[PDB]
């Protein structure tokens with residue numbers, strides 16, 4: 018599945034990710050800048066935060082309380098598009114998924 022990461026400045030990064038990996042791993046293992054992922058996908062750091070493109074928000078699983086509580090700590094969270102990428106599992110249906118990276122991670 019192809020996953021597209023776009024930095025806050027418009028720089029586009031494309032990666033191919035096997036179903037089963039998380040979007041965070043897809044970015045981390047392929048050298049995409051803008052994602053720190055300090056806690057390693059344990060949903061406890063909010064440094065894997067990204068804005069899902071509106072065209073894809075409804076195609077993703079609903080966020081769990083534990084995730085939303087963490088997003089509150091993220092840098093400039095967006096109520097409609099913000100997600101923790103380590104909580105998004107890649108599947109063939111997400112082929113073409115577009116994710117916008119924030120200016121900074123906290």
Ligand code: FES
Nearest residue numbers: 056058060065103
């Ligand atoms: S990598 Fe820490 S919450 Fe996603």
